[PDB]
Write a protein that binds this ligand. Sequence first.
Ligand SMILES: Nc1ncnc2c1ncn2[C@@H]1O[C@H](COP(=O)(O)OP(=O)(O)O)[C@@H](O)[C@H]1O
Ligand SMILES: [Mg+2]
Lengths: 637, 49
Amino acid sequence: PDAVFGDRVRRFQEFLDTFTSYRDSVRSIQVYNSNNAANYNDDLNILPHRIIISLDDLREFDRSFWSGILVEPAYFIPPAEKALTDLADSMDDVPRHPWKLSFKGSFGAHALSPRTLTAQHLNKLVSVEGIVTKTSLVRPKLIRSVHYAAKTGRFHYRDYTDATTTLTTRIPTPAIYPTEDTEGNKLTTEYGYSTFIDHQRITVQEMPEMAPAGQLPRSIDVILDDDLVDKTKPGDRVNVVGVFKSLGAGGMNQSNSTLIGFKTLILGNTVYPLHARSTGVAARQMLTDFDIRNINKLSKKKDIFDILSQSLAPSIYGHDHIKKAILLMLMGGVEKNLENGSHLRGDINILMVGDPSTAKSQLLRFVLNTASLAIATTGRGSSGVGLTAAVTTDRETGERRLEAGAMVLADRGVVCIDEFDKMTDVDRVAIHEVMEQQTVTIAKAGIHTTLNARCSVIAAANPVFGQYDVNRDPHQNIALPDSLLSRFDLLFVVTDDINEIRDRSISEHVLRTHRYLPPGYLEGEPVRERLNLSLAVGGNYNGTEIPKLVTIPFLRKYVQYAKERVIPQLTQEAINVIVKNYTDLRNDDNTKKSPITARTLETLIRLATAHAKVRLSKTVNKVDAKVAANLLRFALL
Amino acid sequence: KSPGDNIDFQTTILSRFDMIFIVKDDHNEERDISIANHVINIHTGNANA
Ligand SMILES: Nc1ncnc2c1ncn2[C@@H]1O[C@H](COP(=O)(O)OP(=O)(O)O)[C@@H](O)[C@H]1O
Ligand SMILES: [Mg+2]
């Protein structure tokens, strides 16, 4: 026993007794485990034994212990973990794995980068943001092996440790695997009674958004244990909190004799998958009770569809029906999975074609910014393997693996395509399967598999003549195959028609839009750009908490609540309207921009279903069918 | 010819730029004498002074 260890344990007891949030978090974890065990006993998931600790509260409580965790974590983290384990066992007497710790908050000079990490940060708690490039296979590691002696009929065990599982270096005692007891009898390995802990290696590289534009990137290795494995996939932006530790002897023994140096890695304590723009991590926002009541207060208004639509991009004048379509795409319909395995779409796809400089690219960038999992692509820039999938070779196993393109990474999200008309033909054939069957089927040399690509596609295209002509039929104007148009639920032709009063409205809107300052900014001070990273859990300027126009951060919460909560179902009053309008549209004599196929019918359903998500109604009513019908009619006529 | 007829690209890139400048050869003596003297003073070193 060590005196300073006990003193730090008592200090963390005082810190945990001061802030009861950690105490009832321990309570909530233990009661969840107990009710799951009781439900398994009578009639499931087990939460890990770790607690998120705020560094700011610790700094407010004890500066010395906070600086001890940050600077010398090997001497301060194990006393805190023992204190948390003792606190957990204090209240667990009435109802075995030791409790771990994780850290959030400001790290100061310890919030670093894979490039910025040098040897002065060794043996220190660092928070490193970056991008996951390599993720090793989750491998079990033997901790305690259990053996059986049949001659004497007794069970033995042996514990195994390495330098990774401990923060403080001890004497390395390699205990061999026992195949024979002390008396000489043969032992049988009792698999199922031995304990194995999941181990993972990930490689965190600096983000390409914050990296120098021509230099080779720097990377670090992070070790993860049982509760922290499988929290990342390659391509994620991450924040890893952990101890930067050196291991072994850097060639200073006789046997090693080389200049790898001391091997350096991070013992991961906390993994936060950060949301970034056009990445694979979906943005999630915590819904408080006040925000839920606000969302339910919006849902009861009759004008609800026209506030959320007009509150999309208030800095773009007009294009209101496109705002409605984008909102309904963000809601996303209901996906049907039939009992025989056949699949029906829920996602809404929007194509916009028309004259240059008509807020098409800006609307695509808005969808990239405001959607949870939007990924931006351009026409020529990405190819058939770029959007769907490709094959690469593993270094360790030696077998081929897959790399996920834009459609696979944007599963349950939005793909924002700019310059849609400049796709190659093979890319277009790749798009045909994704837009309808919602899957990517790849049959390469030895690899045959289907990936889920359930995406909503919003696309911007230009006419082949550079401008839309009213007198010429749309077949030569858009000049796109009818299969592709049938894939798109809503096709919008945007025309830059010149009118005096319209141009005056454009000028006044833009000039009032260019006269804005953020709060806390001076008149001549230039606006600073901060890169947007959000933690993923689980023309009027003065829009603040629904005065007339809804804020974008509250629009995101409304969309998240609607997608997670309500799954509306059709009823006969909507079906009659949908059937009548589809029959009228199929047999109308009017020329239309898009051909009317069977897909249009389901389009109506999806659109109606999307409107039912706007109202937070479990039922799809007649008004939803009518607003779907007249949004479709404007796009067609 | 039209300004979009002389470009070897689509007319949308012209609208995409902020300010376009169509630069001329004026093709008269009173300008190219001045240009020739300017270039000769550049090569001589008077323009450096
Ligand atoms: N209806 C509109 N309201 C406000 N601004 C617009 C509108 N249409 C175009 N703009 C402006 O024109 C510029 C051109 O971008 P954009 O129109 O998106 O190009 P494209 O139409 O070729 O995709 C944008 O900066 C945008 O601010
Ligand atoms: Mg554009």
